Amino acid sequence: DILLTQSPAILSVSPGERVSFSCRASQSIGTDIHWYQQRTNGSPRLLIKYASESISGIPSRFSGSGSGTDFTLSINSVESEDIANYYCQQSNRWPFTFGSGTKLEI
């Protein structure tokens, strides 16, 4: 099964800086990685699909990059409402799996 490693588990940034979340797959999975945001007591929300594709309604300061085993979710200039947990999820092989999450702290 595809193991997804998100490290580090906690990211500490200053307001308005660029932040990057890492997600590493235990084997090559093309661009089949999707990124979700979960705020406190909220349900997950899709941010980026297929490693880099935008979702309507998501602010444009979110972007994603990478292919193969190494994936990055990026926030241009973080702000308070970005405080949340961030999960990656692969859909290359069955079963779908999730990474363990990175918390954003400001």
């Binding site: 859909s91 092989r93 079963p95």
Partner: protein, 103 residues
């Protein structure tokens, strides 16, 4: 119309149906098998086309019994289609050569 052209068009229609149905059924068969990659519909449709044409890059392939049975139906539909079209072409060329030589 002539039978060979009706048969070729029929076969093209049936082939399109086999590609779509096979894509749906491949995903249905392969989800639940750990390691399977034929598990989302867009790339399953692509796989069904490169299987029907007998190209088979190997970027995707089924691992279950039912996914492989579906693959076999897709291969045979593709090869039969291509055979039907070749035969219809031959029939057209043979008849036009008969006429051109005066029967």
């Amino acid at each position: 119309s002539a039978l060979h052209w009706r048969a070729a068009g029929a076969a093209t229609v049936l082939l399109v149906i086999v590609l779509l149905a096979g894509s749906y059924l491949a995903v249905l068969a392969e989800r639940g098998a750990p390691g399977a990659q034929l598990i989302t519909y867009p790339r399953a449709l692509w796989w069904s086309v490169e299987t029907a044409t007998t190209v088979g890059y190997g970027d995707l392939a089924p691992v279950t019994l039912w996914g492989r049975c579906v693959a076999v139906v897709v291969m045979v539909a593709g090869i039969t289609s291509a055979g039907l079209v070749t035969a219809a072409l031959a029939t057209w060329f043979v008849g036009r050569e008969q006429e051109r030589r005066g029967h």
